[PDB]
Write a protein that binds this ligand. Structure first.
Ligand SMILES: *[C@@H]1O[C@H](CO)[C@@H](O[C@@H]2O[C@H](CO)[C@@H](O[C@@H]3O[C@H](CO)[C@@H](O)[C@H](O[C@@H]4O[C@H](CO)[C@@H](O)[C@H](O)[C@@H]4O)[C@@H]3O)[C@H](O)[C@H]2NC(C)=O)[C@H](O)[C@H]1NC(C)=O
Ligand SMILES: *[C@@H]1O[C@H](CO)[C@@H](O[C@@H]2O[C@H](CO)[C@@H](O[C@H]3O[C@H](CO)[C@@H](O)[C@H](O)[C@@H]3O)[C@H](O)[C@H]2NC(C)=O)[C@H](O)[C@H]1NC(C)=O
Ligand SMILES: *[C@@H]1O[C@H](CO)[C@@H](O[C@@H]2O[C@H](CO)[C@@H](O)[C@H](O)[C@H]2NC(C)=O)[C@H](O)[C@H]1NC(C)=O
Ligand SMILES: *[C@@H]1O[C@H](CO)[C@@H](O[C@@H]2O[C@H](CO)[C@@H](O)[C@H](O)[C@H]2NC(C)=O)[C@H](O)[C@H]1NC(C)=O
Ligand SMILES: *C/C=C(C)/C=C/C=C(C)\C=C\C1=C(C)CCCC1(C)C
Ligand SMILES: *C/C=C(C)/C=C/C=C(C)\C=C\C1=C(C)CCCC1(C)C
Ligand SMILES: CCCCCCCS[C@@H]1O[C@H](CO)[C@@H](O)[C@H](O)[C@H]1O
Ligand SMILES: CCCCCCCS[C@@H]1O[C@H](CO)[C@@H](O)[C@H](O)[C@H]1O
Ligand SMILES: CCCCCCCS[C@@H]1O[C@H](CO)[C@@H](O)[C@H](O)[C@H]1O
Ligand SMILES: CCCCCCCS[C@@H]1O[C@H](CO)[C@@H](O)[C@H](O)[C@H]1O
Ligand SMILES: CCCCCCCCCCCCCCCC(=O)O
Ligand SMILES: CCCCCCCCCCCCCCCC(=O)O
Ligand SMILES: *C(=O)CCCCCCCCCCCCCCC
Ligand SMILES: *C(=O)CCCCCCCCCCCCCCC
Ligand SMILES: *C(=O)CCCCCCCCCCCCCCC
Ligand SMILES: *C(=O)CCCCCCCCCCCCCCC
Ligand SMILES: [Hg+2]
Ligand SMILES: [Hg+2]
Ligand SMILES: [Hg+2]
Ligand SMILES: [Hg+2]
Ligand SMILES: [Hg+2]
Ligand SMILES: [Hg+2]
Ligand SMILES: [Zn+2]
Ligand SMILES: [Zn+2]
Ligand SMILES: [Zn+2]
Ligand SMILES: [Zn+2]
Ligand SMILES: [Zn+2]
Ligand SMILES: [Zn+2]
Ligand SMILES: [Zn+2]
Lengths: 348, 348
């Protein structure tokens, strides 16, 4: 056999030399140099040290500034929360695991690592549809007088979690399972074994369809609509109203946010689909480690896009960080937002 | 003319089309795509969001743990502090500047961005000599009963800032000057123009010798001395004493620290030396941008080497992060301590 299937796992290493051991019982240093595990460990350490502050800081700003309540502000507040979950929820285990070379917490550690990474990713993917829709509603404006309220945003948010819980919780209760991958320091869905006892093959299809191909079709199709109407071609002050101009900024970011999701997940999903369609073939530990641990950056790239592609949000942050206020930058040249300062309501 | 010299700058772009404008007065979007400035803008954001926690942590752990007071301990606290300066002193403006496309804060910002970036870089170069010496004094011990104590370290520390300020301060008071480089989003020493009115051509030769060639000669030399004695080969617990085998690791770190320094600064120094000897020649904005924004990682690669190459520091760190004790691991093995818990001394 090309690999060592265990009842709980599937090590991508032949056991001809009988040197293969359960990644829930002993170091996997026989799969790769030990330094490389340190590598992974130093990596998760840095990601945690970047992901915590960047996502908490986002969370804290969105709240503090009572005027940041656009559907986007809700969605990115939702992501920052999911990213904190990814950090303490699973990165903490994936760091611990890397340090020891194996899932010392056994299948639990594997479930924590895998669950939160999946939850993290699906919430992102599903938050992208909500943005794709919202963006469609304000650019191709399906209604004549429709305007999303905080209520609607709270809907989109609750939605992304129902969807995300949908494919990330089942593997905890019998439908498929989380199993170590690559060097065995991370956990993903089971694409490796057919394990009928838990219906692995049906769950992988369901997942690749309902939680990948469909959300992308929607996301890509919607874009084919905001091709004729609002286009990346953005100018200076006003564009058909400074309001229209600023509507163009949010869309650029939402597009960029997609490219960012794709870069971060196609490589993982790709290798995932490959194996699924080549179970038992001869692949090794590094095959899925690289995409797997690269995708963990998904826990931080969103807030950074937000802060670099949103004049408003960026300033509230400076306003927050500079304790008092004095939001240098260049403001939004438009509305602002905060708590005691200029969070003054400015309607009609 | 290949570039556009202003009385204050030197944009590496022709003004044949008359689209060139002072990097102190308007976006340089005509030098490179605006998405590229956002890319730099992001990059600095991450550096700031990583270099801050990691350097503050290094600082806080050293201070808090009493046994952490060897010469090395002294130096890397220095770095952690020089790094904190690079981040808040200069990175902050380079971030703001990149977000805007030019130095909205004019030459003050150029001086801020440039000064601190040099201060940091030079402090790190001199501290590599201090280490070079200390390493020599302990491996080729040309002394009889001379111990390189804290008093010496606090010396070699003040020393480094006296040298660093030596080349980092003059451009602020008439000798040479700081000026935008590459995409005009970071500042450096004037290698581009002769500006006799400020003696650029002399300050550069001074610098490339007093604060580059010399230090490197000494450091590369002190590496020659410890060629016969301590080497790269270091067995397990002990080699001629575990104390003799424990010093061979601080040496292997000091060497890695230098390798890292060279990778971070040779490219830049090189590009800089090339331009100084090809002023007016036809180079573009990306030419200096790539090496220039890469040497900025200088603000964070040190605390990383340290946490991965110094068992003692590492363990003391985890102790601090695990609040109380929970040293878990396998303890330093030799010495340990903290703020109070294991702070218990056992010297001589
Ligand atoms: C590259 O080649 C360009 C084409 O020849 C050349 O264009 C000249 O650019 C300057 C500015 O860079 C123009 O002069 C400005 O004119 C405006 C009037 O619209 C003034 O407002 C401005 O001065 C003001 O001064 C105020 C007080 O100091 C200050 O508050 C304002 O902000 C502002 O600075 C300038 O006088 C000039 O008209 C342009 N000439 C032509 C024919 O277009 C570029 O200068 C040149 N770029 C280089 C060499 O860097
Ligand atoms: C790869 O081949 C290895 C050699 O055949 C094989 O090692 C075997 O590991 C089991 C662990 O389950 C050992 O069995 C021991 O199990 C418990 C210990 O927890 C106790 O009942 C006894 O100590 C018992 O011996 C086998 O002894 C050992 N066989 C050997 C080395 O001869 C691995 O299990 C294989 N890896 C796979 C397929 O997962
Ligand atoms: C073990 O791995 C090898 C290589 O991945 C597999 O060999 C391939 O087998 C398929 C048929 O299943 C052929 O189409 C390929 O041409 C073979 N490639 C090579 C390099 O021989 C082998 O099938 C695997 N063993 C199993 C089934 O577990
Ligand atoms: C403008 O830049 C060009 C390119 O760097 C310079 O042209 C070079 O000039 C040197 C000396 O005059 C020659 O040895 C090279 O062969 C030239 N490069 C080539 C092959 O084109 C030019 O000197 C610069 N001129 C200005 C305005 O300073
Ligand atoms: C390090 C841990 C990782 C990368 C675990 C991920 C698990 C998992 C099942 C992820 C699935 C997917 C996404 C999230 C994004 C869309 C594509 C999927 C279905 C491959
Ligand atoms: C982003 C800011 C940068 C790269 C500024 C650097 C400024 C400067 C004058 C640096 C000089 C040097 C060092 C520091 C290291 C050794 C080599 C020098 C002399 C090129
Ligand atoms: C970026 C998307 C990546 C898509 C996944 C392509 C996997 S490709 C796969 O890799 C194996 C590694 O052992 C090779 O042995 C095999 O020949 C090759 O076809
Ligand atoms: C965090 C990575 C972001 C880098 C990707 C930039 C994509 S695009 C970039 O976005 C800026 C902010 O809205 C705009 O001002 C600018 O005009 C636009 O070209
Ligand atoms: C170790 C890194 C040192 C880098 C110094 C090499 C500079 S190389 C120099 O660059 C000019 C501008 O692009 C070109 O026009 C020219 O042809 C090329 O030789
Ligand atoms: C929480 C901060 C993360 C830094 C990681 C510290 C790894 S520390 C490492 O751990 C090994 C076994 O667990 C011990 O045997 C060894 O002595 C210890 O230095
Ligand atoms: C189109 C692309 C969007 C690209 C964005 C970049 C911003 C992302 C952050 C990546 C985290 C990298 C972590 C460093 C770990 C060492
Ligand atoms: C869009 C930009 C991606 C930028 C990314 C990351 C930059 C940061 C990390 C530097 C840590 C280097 C580690 C020291 C190892 C020697
Ligand atoms: C409210 O306005 C406080 C601002 C919050 C940002 C943090 C600013 C830190 C100040 C820089 C510290 C200099 C480093 C010194 C190291 C010894
Ligand atoms: C205003 O005073 C100038 C802005 C200075 C801000 C410096 C940026 C440092 C970012 C650190 C924030 C970390 C967030 C902490 C989360 C717990
Ligand atoms: C001990 O109690 C185990 C818990 C330690 C925390 C988990 C490791 C996270 C990586 C460190 C990043 C912390 C960021 C704050 C730096 C000042
Ligand atoms: C002092 O000992 C405290 C160290 C910091 C605690 C970090 C320990 C990691 C535990 C996992 C995080 C809990 C899940 C929360 C998800 C939001
Ligand atoms: Hg869309
Ligand atoms: Hg990514
Ligand atoms: Hg704001
Ligand atoms: Hg030396
Ligand atoms: Hg470097
Ligand atoms: Hg300690
Ligand atoms: Zn089973
Ligand atoms: Zn889902
Ligand atoms: Zn199958
Ligand atoms: Zn601004
Ligand atoms: Zn002058
Ligand atoms: Zn100097
Ligand atoms: Zn010259």
């Amino acid at each position: 056999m090309n690999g060592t299937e265990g009842p709980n796992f599937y090590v991508p290493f032949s056991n001809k030399t009988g040197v293969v051991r359960s990644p829930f019982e002993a170091p996997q240093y026989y799969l790769a140099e030990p330094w490389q595990f340190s590598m992974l460990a130093a990596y998760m350490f840095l990601l945690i040290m970047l992901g915590f502050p960047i996502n908490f800081l986002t969370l804290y700003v969105t709240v503090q500034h009572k005027k940041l309540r656009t559907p986007l502000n809700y969605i990115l507040l939702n992501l920052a929360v999911a990213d904190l979950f990814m950090v303490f929820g699973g990165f903490t285990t994936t760091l611990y695991t890397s340090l020891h070379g194996y899932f010392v917490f056994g299948p639990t550690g594997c479930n924590l690592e895998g669950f939160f990474a999946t939850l993290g990713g699906e919430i992102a993917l599903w938050s992208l549809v909500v943005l794709a829709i919202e963006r469609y509603v304000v650019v191709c404006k399906p209604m004549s007088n429709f305007r999303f309220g905080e209520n609607h945003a709270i809907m989109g948010v609750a939605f992304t979690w129902v969807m995300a819980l949908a494919c990330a919780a089942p593997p905890l209760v019998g439908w498929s399972r989380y199993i170590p991958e690559g060097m065995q320091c991370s956990c993903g869905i089971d694409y490796y074994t057919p394990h009928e006892e838990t219906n692995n093959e049906s769950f992988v299809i369901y997942m690749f369809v309902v939680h990948f191909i469909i959300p992308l079709i929607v996301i890509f199709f919607c874009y084919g609509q905001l091709v004729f109407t609002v286009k990346e071609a953005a100018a200076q002050q006003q564009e058909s109203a400074t309001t229209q101009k600023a509507e163009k900024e949010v869309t650029r970011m939402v597009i960029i946010m997609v490219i960012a999701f794709l870069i971060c997940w196609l490589p993982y999903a790709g290798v995932a689909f490959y194996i699924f369609t080549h179970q038992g073939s001869d692949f090794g530990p590094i095959f899925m480690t690289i995409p797997a641990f690269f995708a963990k950056t998904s826990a931080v790239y969103n807030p950074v896009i937000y802060i670099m592609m949103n004049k408003q949000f960026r300033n509230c942050m400076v306003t927050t960080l500079c304790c008092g206020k004095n939001p240098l930058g260049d403001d939004e040249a438009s509305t602002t937002v905060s708590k005691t300062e200029t969070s003054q309501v400015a309607p009609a």
